[PDB]
Design an enzyme around this catalytic site. Sequence first.
Site, mmCIF file in Angstrom:
data_model
loop_
_atom_site.group_PDB
_atom_site.id
_atom_site.type_symbol
_atom_site.label_atom_id
_atom_site.label_comp_id
_atom_site.label_asym_id
_atom_site.label_seq_id
_atom_site.Cartn_x
_atom_site.Cartn_y
_atom_site.Cartn_z
ATOM 1 N N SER A 99 0.805 -1.218 0.000
ATOM 2 C CA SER A 99 0.000 0.000 0.000
ATOM 3 C C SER A 99 0.853 1.289 0.000
ATOM 4 C CB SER A 99 -0.938 -0.048 1.218
ATOM 5 O OG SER A 99 -1.990 0.891 1.124
ATOM 6 N N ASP A 237 -2.065 6.787 -3.642
ATOM 7 C CA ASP A 237 -0.959 6.074 -3.019
ATOM 8 C C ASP A 237 -0.571 4.816 -3.805
ATOM 9 O OD1 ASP A 237 -2.952 4.283 -2.237
ATOM 10 O OD2 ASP A 237 -2.211 4.113 -0.189
ATOM 11 N N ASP A 239 -1.035 1.497 -3.875
ATOM 12 C CA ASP A 239 -2.024 0.564 -4.426
ATOM 13 C C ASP A 239 -3.301 1.289 -4.848
ATOM 14 O OD1 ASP A 239 -3.026 1.037 -1.881
ATOM 15 O OD2 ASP A 239 -3.609 -1.036 -1.504
ATOM 16 N N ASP A 241 -5.780 2.838 -3.163
ATOM 17 C CA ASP A 241 -7.035 2.756 -2.420
ATOM 18 C C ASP A 241 -7.182 3.998 -1.537
ATOM 19 O OD1 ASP A 241 -5.402 2.254 -0.207
ATOM 20 O OD2 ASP A 241 -6.523 0.519 0.474
HETATM 21 ZN ZN LIG Z 1 -3.215 2.186 0.042
#
Ligand SMILES: [Zn+2]
Lengths: 440, 441
Positions: A99, A237, A239, A241
């Site tokens: 992430s 960011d 990934d 999300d």
């Molecule tokens: Zn993230």
Amino acid sequence: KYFGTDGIRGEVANSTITVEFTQKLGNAVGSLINQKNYPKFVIVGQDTRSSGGFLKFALVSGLNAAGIDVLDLGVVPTPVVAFMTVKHRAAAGFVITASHNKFTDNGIKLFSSNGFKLDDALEEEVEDMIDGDFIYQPQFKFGSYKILANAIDEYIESIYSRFAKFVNYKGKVVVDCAHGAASHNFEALLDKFGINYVSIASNPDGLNINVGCGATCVSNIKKAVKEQKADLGISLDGDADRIIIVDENGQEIDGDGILNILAQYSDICGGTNGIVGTQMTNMSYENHYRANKIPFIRSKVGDRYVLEDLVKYGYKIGGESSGHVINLNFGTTGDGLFTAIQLLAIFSQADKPVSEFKLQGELMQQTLINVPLTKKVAREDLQKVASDVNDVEKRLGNRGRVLLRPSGTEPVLRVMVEADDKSLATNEAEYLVEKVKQKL
Amino acid sequence: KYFGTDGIRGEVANSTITVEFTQKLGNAVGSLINQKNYPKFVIVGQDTRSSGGFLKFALVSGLNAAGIDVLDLGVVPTPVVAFMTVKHRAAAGFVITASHNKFTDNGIKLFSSNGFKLDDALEEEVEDMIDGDFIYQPQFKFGSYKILANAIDEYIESIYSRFAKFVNYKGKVVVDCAHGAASHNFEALLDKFGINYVSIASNPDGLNINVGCGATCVSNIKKAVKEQKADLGISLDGDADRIIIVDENGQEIDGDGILNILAQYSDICGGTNGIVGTQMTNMSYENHYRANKIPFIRSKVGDRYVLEDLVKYGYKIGGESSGHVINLNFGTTGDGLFTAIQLLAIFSQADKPVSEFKLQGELMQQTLINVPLTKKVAREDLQKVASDVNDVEKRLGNRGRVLLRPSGTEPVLRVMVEADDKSLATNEAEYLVEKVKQKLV
Ligand SMILES: [Zn+2]
Ligand SMILES: [Zn+2]
């Protein structure tokens, strides 16, 4: 214990993120699938980290051995794997990602067939299996592996078909993709809407993910917007999300501010009976929701609680400060790309700059004082200072609030007071600090 | 030790062939590649076993972790992986296969950058590396994985450029691909030359490799050739490095017989100063080579020995009864597809049938007798009966020969006599058995 806070994520080869744990995890999830008689089919995706590949293939060998087929979406944002997991009849979905974490970390995010992040009970069922034995499909019906071509297409078209009628944005956008999974994928989505954009971090080399860019380095997008004299900045960011945006003056609008804007155009966002925030949401927003008769819930702070609260109350739009924004009308997880499109649909409704959509008037400022202790905490020890918290809040009225939280991992009590008047936030914080020393 | 008689091969799960071991192996070789400063790039391929996929991905995760890129050719014959390893500048080639073994087995074959099967010394390095710790690329430079589209095209085109004009076969051929790696591939190659053929085992489902078909079950092709009234039969094994053929009568011609045909047309086969066989080569062929002034060498029974002897003597064509045939003018390993096309190029030279290419006359016959002992048979034990072996051979002249063998590390001595006269072979074997019983243990 493997999951816990965050849920499977650590430095590569200096953590639980080893090629052998990941192989065993893949097999364990596969065994649960066989046990539950779910579809012998899962979906996998990854971000741009160079370690993603080998960790992925480790997972895959575990899955295949169990008898489970894998469809590889390659490099896609986290929300895309969840999307395909629900769309197609997959038993689960995996994302090799850490992430927002530094480029030397990695991990695995898990989604069930309903497209939701694994819950507390499911995580413990997985862990019991992992500590079990490696199991080979008894009938030798081992799994296959296929790479889906043009993997992002379905997700893109799904979003386009829903928002094409609303999107009519003619401003200049700077997009920061953190050199992460949204690299190229986000631009392909934007092109579909004929958006005038500029990319500043869509050049992954396997080692530059989140490095001085993306949603956790909002300084990058703020400088780029000013430099580029842009009308809007969108930062995602690793990934993707998580989303943070900036207005025409390079002013940051966080997850709280973003959620407030969606709430104000909830019909265009599919509809919602209420908004779910967290313990961290700025009270300026809480006050705004109440003034406009919009039900607001402060969730038990982060990691999956916002989702569980949304489902509990039948609300669709919820989000947090960090930038994780969820819209159950379309997704089952935080989605930066989808939120971006909603925002752009919203900014097309009025002929005014981005800063005029934002909550007007100065947001409340916070004073946090970490009171060092030598002893542990508990619930009954928090009830000794309850009367003093209530006093402070009574006197603050609608102009401030108090948040007391223990550390659990260390003998430290974090005393926070947020208020319209920072001078006053620091005053009452220091007052509470003294009361806890007297009471504890 | 992990390399055995078959060199990393065994029952899936219930052996040394697990996901974890394969993962450590992939990495191990990666470390050796880094250590030797070789190209950080390897070629990977597999047969039709359903267990190949997951074992491969285990291997690949280990290689990537070490910093090695992987080009995956998918389902292709063993010789194809070696071709690609040698052609491209790869440091190694991997094959996920258990060759002719039952569908429940699997394993890994390894080739060096020169396209040859790892030797004894290289095997040890790997084993020592495996016993190491698992090593991650220190600069976080991890390997990628790519699947090569139309993976077999280069192989097929290479064989075609070479033979396109040699080959003009008009007979009806039956092909048995053993539901193995040659399924579809061999048909594609045969199509290039406009061959008239019928496939009887190119329908892989991941559990039928070698099941009652292929080179290890010659009955399948024999029966097919008869019913189809075909002019020729070609049978390959699971990874297609063995070839057995059948003439128009359904009569089997094995590796010995095939090699003898290549010897007779060695010039059309690129050339060779001599032929390398094994201890198992039927003496009828040995007598034939000698009669035609073709140097012949008996290798120390399969196990990469034929290739080591080919290189040593500077010969190009060698093989064994199993059907592993090697032509160093083109390949670096046993290849049944290439040998097939070579034979059709040869069968294009004469307007006679396949049965007339065979060594004319009766092949010698063999009698094998096992003698159980107290210990594995060493060379000091075989010396005790040397004088009896010499006696038997002296009396057999050109009409036969003796071959005594240990059973590796098993407490059994294998007594074989090969002769024109079957009765005599049994007689002499029985005689030697009695000598062994008198002198050993
Ligand atoms: Zn993230
Ligand atoms: Zn073979």
